[PDB]
Amino acid sequence: KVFGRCELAAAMKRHGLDNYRGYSLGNWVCAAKFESNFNTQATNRNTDGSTDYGILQINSRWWCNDGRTPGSRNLCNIPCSALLSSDITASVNCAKKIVSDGNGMNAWVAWRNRCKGTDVQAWIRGCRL
Q: What is the DSSP letter of 30?
A: H
Q: Which residues are identified as catalytic? A: 35, 52
Residue 72: give its domain's CATH number.
1.10.530.10
Concatenated DSSP letters for 45-94? E-TTS-EEETTTTEETTTS-B-S-STT---TT-SBGGGGGSSSTHHHHHH
Give the C-alpha separation, 87 to 83, whole Å: 9
Among 53, 129, 65, smallest CA distance to 91 is for 53
Judge whether 48 is annotated as a binding position: no
Number of domains in the chain: 1
> Residue 23: beta bridge partners?
20
**What residues contact residue 11 under an 8 Å CB cut-off, 6+ apart?**
3, 88
The experimental resolution of this structure, in angstroms, equals 2.0
Give the C-alpha separation, 3 to 127, whole Å: 13
Query: What is the domain range of residue 51?
Result: 1-129
Experiment type: X-ray
